[PDB]
Coordinates of C-alpha atoms in Angstrom, one line a residue:
Chain R
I90 CA -16.3 34.7 -1.5
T91 CA -15.4 36.6 1.7
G92 CA -13.5 35.2 3.6
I93 CA -11.0 32.4 4.1
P94 CA -11.3 29.5 1.6
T95 CA -12.0 26.1 2.9
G96 CA -10.3 24.9 -0.3
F97 CA -13.6 23.3 -1.2
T98 CA -15.5 25.0 -4.2
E99 CA -19.1 24.7 -3.1
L100 CA -18.6 24.9 0.6
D101 CA -17.1 28.3 -0.2
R102 CA -20.3 29.4 -2.0
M103 CA -22.8 28.8 0.8
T104 CA -20.5 30.4 3.3
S105 CA -18.1 32.7 1.3
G106 CA -15.4 31.8 4.0
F107 CA -15.1 31.4 7.1
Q108 CA -14.8 35.0 8.0
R109 CA -13.5 36.9 11.0
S110 CA -15.3 36.8 14.4
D111 CA -17.5 33.8 13.6
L112 CA -17.5 30.6 15.7
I113 CA -17.9 27.6 13.5
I114 CA -18.9 24.3 15.1
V115 CA -18.6 21.1 13.1
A116 CA -20.3 18.2 14.7
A117 CA -20.3 14.5 13.7
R118 CA -20.7 11.0 15.3
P119 CA -17.5 9.1 16.2
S120 CA -15.4 8.1 13.1
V121 CA -17.4 9.9 10.4
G122 CA -14.3 12.0 9.8
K123 CA -14.7 15.3 11.7
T124 CA -11.0 15.6 12.5
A125 CA -10.0 14.6 9.0
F126 CA -12.3 17.4 7.8
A127 CA -11.1 20.1 10.1
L128 CA -7.5 19.1 9.3
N129 CA -8.0 19.4 5.5
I130 CA -9.4 22.9 5.9
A131 CA -6.5 23.8 8.2
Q132 CA -4.2 22.4 5.5
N133 CA -5.7 24.2 2.5
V134 CA -5.7 27.5 4.5
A135 CA -2.0 26.9 5.3
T136 CA -0.6 25.7 2.0
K137 CA -2.7 27.7 -0.4
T138 CA -3.3 31.1 1.2
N139 CA -0.6 32.7 3.5
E140 CA -2.4 32.8 6.8
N141 CA -1.3 31.1 10.0
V142 CA -3.6 28.4 11.4
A143 CA -3.6 27.2 15.0
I144 CA -4.7 23.7 15.7
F145 CA -5.4 22.4 19.2
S146 CA -5.5 18.6 19.0
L147 CA -6.6 17.6 22.5
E148 CA -7.2 14.0 21.5
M149 CA -4.6 12.8 19.0
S150 CA -0.9 13.5 19.4
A151 CA 0.9 16.3 17.5
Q152 CA 2.9 14.0 15.3
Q153 CA 0.2 11.3 14.7
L154 CA -1.7 14.4 13.3
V155 CA 1.0 15.5 10.9
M156 CA 1.1 12.2 9.0
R157 CA -2.7 12.4 8.8
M158 CA -2.1 15.6 6.8
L159 CA 1.1 14.4 5.1
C160 CA -1.0 11.5 3.8
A161 CA -3.7 14.0 2.9
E162 CA -1.2 15.6 0.6
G163 CA 1.3 14.0 -1.6
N164 CA -1.5 11.4 -2.1
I165 CA 0.5 8.9 0.0
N166 CA -0.3 5.7 1.8
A167 CA -1.5 2.1 1.5
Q168 CA 2.1 1.0 1.4
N169 CA 2.2 2.4 4.3
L170 CA 4.0 5.2 6.3
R171 CA 2.9 3.2 9.5
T172 CA 4.0 -0.3 8.3
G173 CA 7.7 0.6 7.8
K174 CA 8.9 0.4 4.2
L175 CA 7.8 2.4 1.1
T176 CA 8.2 2.2 -2.7
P177 CA 10.4 4.6 -4.8
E178 CA 7.0 6.2 -5.5
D179 CA 6.1 6.8 -1.9
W180 CA 9.6 8.2 -1.0
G181 CA 9.7 10.5 -4.0
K182 CA 6.4 11.8 -2.8
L183 CA 6.7 12.4 0.9
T184 CA 9.8 14.5 0.0
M185 CA 7.4 16.9 -1.9
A186 CA 4.6 16.5 0.6
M187 CA 7.1 17.2 3.3
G188 CA 8.5 20.1 1.2
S189 CA 5.1 21.8 0.5
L190 CA 3.8 21.4 4.0
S191 CA 7.2 22.6 5.2
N192 CA 6.4 26.2 4.3
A193 CA 2.8 26.0 5.5
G194 CA 1.6 28.2 8.4
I195 CA 0.5 25.5 10.8
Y196 CA 0.9 25.6 14.6
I197 CA -0.1 22.5 16.6
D198 CA -0.7 22.2 20.3
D199 CA -1.5 18.8 21.7
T200 CA -1.5 19.8 25.3
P201 CA -3.5 16.9 26.9
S202 CA -6.7 18.7 27.7
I203 CA -6.6 22.5 28.3
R204 CA -8.8 25.2 29.8
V205 CA -10.2 27.9 27.4
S206 CA -8.2 30.7 29.1
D207 CA -5.0 29.0 27.8
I208 CA -6.3 28.5 24.2
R209 CA -7.0 32.2 24.4
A210 CA -3.6 33.1 25.8
Chain G
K73 CA 7.0 -26.0 -28.3
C74 CA 9.5 -24.8 -25.7
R75 CA 12.1 -27.1 -27.3
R76 CA 11.8 -25.6 -30.8
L77 CA 11.9 -22.0 -29.4
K78 CA 15.2 -22.7 -27.6
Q79 CA 17.2 -23.5 -30.8
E80 CA 15.7 -20.8 -32.9
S81 CA 15.7 -17.7 -30.7
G82 CA 17.0 -18.4 -27.1
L83 CA 14.6 -18.9 -24.1
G84 CA 15.2 -18.2 -20.4
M85 CA 11.9 -18.8 -18.7
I86 CA 8.9 -21.1 -19.0
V87 CA 5.9 -19.6 -17.1
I88 CA 3.1 -22.1 -17.2
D89 CA -0.4 -20.9 -16.3
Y90 CA -1.9 -23.0 -13.8
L91 CA -0.9 -26.7 -13.4
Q92 CA -4.2 -28.0 -12.0
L93 CA -5.5 -26.9 -15.4
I94 CA -3.0 -28.7 -17.7
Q95 CA -4.0 -32.1 -19.1
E96 CA -2.0 -37.8 -12.3
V97 CA -0.7 -34.3 -11.6
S98 CA 2.2 -36.0 -9.8
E99 CA 3.0 -37.5 -13.3
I100 CA 2.9 -33.9 -14.7
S101 CA 4.9 -32.5 -11.8
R102 CA 7.6 -35.1 -12.7
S103 CA 7.5 -34.0 -16.4
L104 CA 7.8 -30.3 -15.7
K105 CA 10.9 -30.9 -13.6
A106 CA 12.5 -32.9 -16.5
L107 CA 11.5 -30.1 -18.9
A108 CA 13.4 -27.6 -16.8
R109 CA 16.4 -30.0 -16.6
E110 CA 16.5 -30.6 -20.4
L111 CA 16.3 -26.9 -21.4
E112 CA 18.5 -25.5 -18.6
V113 CA 15.8 -23.0 -17.8
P114 CA 13.7 -22.1 -14.7
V115 CA 10.1 -23.3 -15.1
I116 CA 7.5 -21.4 -13.1
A117 CA 4.4 -23.5 -12.6
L118 CA 1.6 -21.6 -11.0
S119 CA -0.7 -23.6 -8.7
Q120 CA -4.1 -23.4 -7.0
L121 CA -4.9 -24.4 -3.4
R122 CA -3.1 -19.3 5.1
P123 CA -1.1 -21.0 3.4
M124 CA 1.5 -23.9 3.8
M125 CA 2.8 -27.2 2.4
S126 CA -0.1 -29.7 2.9
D127 CA -2.6 -27.4 1.1
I128 CA -1.2 -28.4 -2.4
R129 CA 0.5 -31.6 -1.4
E130 CA -2.8 -33.5 -0.7
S131 CA -3.6 -32.9 -4.4
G132 CA -0.8 -34.6 -6.4
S133 CA 2.8 -34.9 -5.3
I134 CA 4.7 -31.8 -6.5
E135 CA 6.5 -31.3 -3.1
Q136 CA 9.5 -33.6 -4.0
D137 CA 9.8 -32.5 -7.6
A138 CA 9.7 -28.7 -7.3
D139 CA 12.9 -27.4 -5.8
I140 CA 11.3 -24.1 -4.8
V141 CA 7.7 -23.6 -3.7
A142 CA 6.5 -20.0 -3.4
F143 CA 3.2 -18.9 -1.8
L144 CA 1.3 -15.7 -2.4
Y145 CA -0.6 -14.5 0.7
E146 CA 3.5 -11.8 1.6
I147 CA 5.6 -14.1 -0.7
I148 CA 6.3 -17.2 1.3
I149 CA 9.2 -19.2 0.0
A150 CA 8.4 -22.3 2.0
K151 CA 10.9 -24.6 0.2
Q152 CA 14.0 -23.8 -1.7
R153 CA 17.3 -25.8 -2.3
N154 CA 19.5 -22.8 -2.9
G155 CA 19.4 -22.0 0.8
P156 CA 17.1 -19.8 2.9
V157 CA 13.4 -20.2 3.7
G158 CA 11.2 -17.3 4.9
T159 CA 8.8 -14.5 4.1
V160 CA 9.5 -11.7 1.5
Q161 CA 7.0 -8.8 1.5
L162 CA 5.8 -7.1 -1.7
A163 CA 3.4 -4.2 -2.3
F164 CA 0.6 -4.5 -4.8
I165 CA -0.9 -1.7 -6.8
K166 CA -4.2 -2.9 -8.3
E167 CA -5.1 0.0 -10.6
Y168 CA -2.0 -0.6 -12.6
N169 CA -2.0 -4.3 -11.7
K170 CA 1.6 -4.2 -10.6
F171 CA 3.5 -6.0 -7.9
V172 CA 6.2 -3.6 -6.6
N173 CA 9.2 -3.4 -4.3
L174 CA 9.5 -2.1 -0.7

């Protein structure tokens, strides 16, 4: 394994990372889960390694993104974060999910739609 | 059976599984109310049918005998004589088969 680990055992094997200088394009039809896939890699690289990740989220807002990876952790949500109130099981969960993702190396930029030069800057 | 259990051990709740399945129902409704009254115990009679009042009413009285009529949908307490009438909302697990708080 090279690289930068994906988190996902057998994705790692074919690729050995994610390695440095390579442009990886992940394509999928609307609502197959391409964002929710890129987010989970971002997450696993943030919480498990020690390596800052930069996420540009041109479509969805910066904070509507965070719950989507807060949910992806503490295994939270049908109860739901969205629809107000939670159970003592949800609360006592978010707190850890918030705590573990708190020390992660994620940087989000939701700037509406930005030119490449800016991404690069 | 409930009568004999009260004198020998205690008793606090009678939870009957579904009424429509006991063995016209207006005459049973009547008797369940009296049972509760005799034993100074809340009797929970489950029933089978959105929902609202006329869904069960059209099939054997009940309405004027039961002093509190709950609906599972949301828990809709559609009639109670203690006071308030409205919607209480409960979470439901499935895997564990629990209804839980919120």
